[PDB]
Amino acid sequence: TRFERDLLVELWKAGFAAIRVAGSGVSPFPCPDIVAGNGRTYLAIEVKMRKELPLYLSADEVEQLVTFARGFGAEAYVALKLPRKKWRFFPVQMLERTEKNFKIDESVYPLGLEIAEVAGKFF
Amino acid sequence: ERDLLVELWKAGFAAIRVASPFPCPDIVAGNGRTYLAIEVKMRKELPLYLSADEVEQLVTFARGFGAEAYVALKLPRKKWRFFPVQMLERTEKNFKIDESVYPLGLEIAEVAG
Numbered sequence: 452t453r454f455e456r457d458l459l460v461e462l463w464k465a466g467f468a469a470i471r472v473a474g475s476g477v478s479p480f481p482c483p484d485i486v487a488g489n490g491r492t493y494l495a496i497e498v499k500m501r502k503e504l505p506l507y508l509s510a511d512e513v514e515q516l517v518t519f520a521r522g523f524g525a526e527a528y529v530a531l532k533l534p535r536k537k538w539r540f541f542p543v544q545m546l547e548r549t550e551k552n553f554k555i556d557e558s559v560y561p562l563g564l565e566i567a568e569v570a571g572k573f574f
Numbered sequence: 575e576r577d578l579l580v581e582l583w584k585a586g587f588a589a590i591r592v593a594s595p596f597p598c599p600d601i602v603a604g605n606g607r608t609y610l611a612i613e614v615k616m617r618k619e620l621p622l623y624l625s626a627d628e629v630e631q632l633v634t635f636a637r638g639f640g641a642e643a644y645v646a647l648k649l650p651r652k653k654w655r656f657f658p659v660q661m662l663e664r665t666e667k668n669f670k671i672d673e674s675v676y677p678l679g680l681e682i683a684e685v686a687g
């Protein structure tokens with residue numbers, strides 16, 4: 452949750468108004484960790500910090516994120532922070548489907564976007 | 575405010591409560607077409623007073639996010655009512671929803687469509 456706050460700062464710096472979601476996992480409704488918007492692009496973000504790859508994500512967590520994004524009208528992203536690395540943003544298409552769940556390993560991580568690119572995608 | 579979340583989802587909005595250095599509303603909602611940034615108030619009776627800072631912060635967030643800024647007000651025995659900021663009565667240094675403003679309030683159905 453310390454890390455969710457750091458990402459908020461980076462999002463605001465990149466031109467997004469962003470909020471952390473109160474009780475993401477503690478609620479009945481699909482929930483991301485952060486929701487952000489800049490008037491054109493809207494983001495539903497699951498926020499993860501790991502000491503090393505790979506990041507594993509359950510099918511359920513990704514399904515929930517995608518369902519929320521569809522209902523809200525936002526793009527679904529996983530934001531992953533590793534030590535000594537800037538935040539990297541993975542559209543859900545970029546997640547590897549494997550063993551009935553999802554993963555970001557060494558073959559996927561380098562393709563993750565920096566926050567500036569997420570904004571520019573619209574154009 | 576959790577009752578409000580349920581009302582928003584029932585009306586077809588995906589809505590979250592907001593958990594600070596930056597401007598932020600109480601609830602943000604969207605249905606793909608309309609996005610809402612909502613300050614949530616529950617009161618026993620009118621008027622409701624809102625500070626200029628609170629309304630300014632709500633409008634700034636709404637402008638930055640790409641949402642419509644609303645105050646949602648719940649009174650006992652009444653359905654939730656939604657007020658765009660331009661509905662608010664401007665007093666000397668504050669904003670207000672009194673008996674004359676309250677009738678203008680939208681119900682959730684109208685906000686969506």
Ligand SMILES: [Cl-]
Pocket residue numbers: 498499500501
């Ligand atoms: Cl984490």
Ligand SMILES: [Cl-]
Pocket residue numbers: 536537
């Ligand atoms: Cl990097």
